Design a protein around this ligand. Structure first.
Ligand SMILES: CCCCCCCCCCCCCCCCCC(=O)OC[C@H](COP(=O)(O)OCCN)OC(=O)CCCCCCCCCCCCCCCCC
Lengths: 57, 68
């Protein structure tokens, strides 16, 4: 049976601090902030070609 | 991308390790004619024209008259 509000381990203060201070929104924000600081994948096409296998047609 | 030589084109795309001046006498294919390398002439007036390789399938008659 799904738990009611009264049988929960989190306090109302703890639960609503995560509510009004957007906690996991900020977590997902920090993910793409980490991705700002890494190496892109782009190759420059007429100067650099991608993959070839000999089977290619 | 059309202006790269064929043996080099496979190398730029990471097909082969050894560049085509690095490969020995045995891999270079035997030919009895010169090589000339046309890249691509699209929009250029040297663009390709297709045509019929053979002559029309049913012949017509050469007119031959006869005075009886
Ligand atoms: C205990 C804490 C303190 C107690 C004092 C009381 C409050 C004081 C603090 C006030 C600050 C309030 C900030 C805004 C409050 C947002 C509250 C919220 O989460 O909205 C909920 C709303 C839908 O509500 P609901 O249907 O109930 O579902 C919620 C899921 N639990 O959800 C929505 O409708 C959409 C939510 C939109 C959230 C904004 C999304 C885009 C904006 C992101 C901004 C990020 C800024 C980061 C910039 C960094 C710069 C370096």
């Amino acid at each position: 049976r799904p738990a009611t509000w009264e049988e929960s381990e989190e306090g109302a203060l703890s639960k609503a601090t995560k509510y009004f201070l957007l906690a996991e929104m900020f977590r997902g924000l920090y993910v793409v902030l980490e991705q700002f600081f890494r190496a892109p994948y782009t190759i420059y096409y007429p100067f650099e070609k991608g993959p070839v296998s000999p089977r290619f047609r | 991308m059309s202006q790269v030589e064929p043996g080099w084109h496979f190398w730029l795309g990471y097909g082969v390790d050894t560049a085509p001046c690095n490969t020995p006498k045995e891999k270079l294919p035997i030919r009895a004619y010169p090589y000339k390398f046309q890249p691509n002439y699209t929009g250029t007036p040297g663009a390709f024209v297709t045509y019929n390789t053979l002559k029309p399938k049913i012949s017509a008659w050469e007119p031959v008259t006869k005075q009886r």
